[PDB]
């Protein structure tokens with residue numbers, strides 16, 4: 001049993017809810033919250049900007065130190081940093097940004113990072129300002145992630161479309 005509430009069960013391991021991932025993290029304080037990161041961990045907008053704002057910029061301060069030491073992530077890659085006030089840990093995962101010309105085939109690699117964690121609160125990778133088709137992102141999620149993932153979908157209209165169209 002875990003603390004996630006009000007989710008629709010899509011599969012054995014994937015759950016979905018129309019929710020602000022910031023507000024969901026604050027309520028649940030999950031072991032892992034996933035950030036929709038870029039390779040520079042520059043948390044300007046989308047999910048990353050919202051998560052970072054909720055940390056009062058502490059996520060960005062930690063991230064800048066991480067990049068100064070390690071250099072940029074790979075598209076499809078991840079790193080584990082603090083979850084600050086939102087979670088124990090933040091898994092910063094870089095899905096391909098279609099609005100920068102990145103190979104959409106890297107979305108499956110991105111979601112494979114989730115398999116290193118038993119339970120996660122996450123957004124749909126490469127959705128929103130990353131430009132991918134969210135219906136595709138949910139299909140890759142279901143077909144790639146084997147651990148327990150709680151997808152908080154920000155847009156109510158998109159949520160209903162994702163549920164209604166789900167095979």
Ligand SMILES: O=C(NCc1ccccc1)c1cnccn1
Pocket residue numbers: 020021022045046047050123127128129154155158
């Ligand atoms: O961009 C965010 N989610 C991604 C998204 C939003 C709309 C349509 C598709 C994808 C976000 C922003 N702020 C808070 C929580 N999520």
